[PDB]
What we know:
The structure is cut from a larger assembly and holds 2 copies of chain A.
Chain A: H1 12-17
PDB class: toxin
Keywords: translocase, calcium, toxin
Chains A, B: ADP-ribosyltransferase binding component
Amino acid sequence: LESNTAGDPYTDYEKASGSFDKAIKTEARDPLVAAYPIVGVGMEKLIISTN
Amino acid sequence: STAVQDSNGESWNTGLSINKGESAYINANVRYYNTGTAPMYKVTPTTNLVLD
């Protein structure tokens, strides 16, 4: 009843057939799983300039 | 009692002032090269300068 089962921009047929972006992990092939990056930022260290 | 006093004086001063956050103004001399198989138009790199 919905074009996108998961909610991600690619539709059911596009996700199933693999006619979408080729850098996406196979775990997102089936419609139930969603293509969703969780990009995060890891701090390494600060430098303080004393003016 | 009268008195007249003349005086001459000379002074030389030097002064060095410096900040502590903008203490220096490095700049680089670099050059781009290509080793792939296709030409690149409007090349712009993002590069990191690291000290140690």
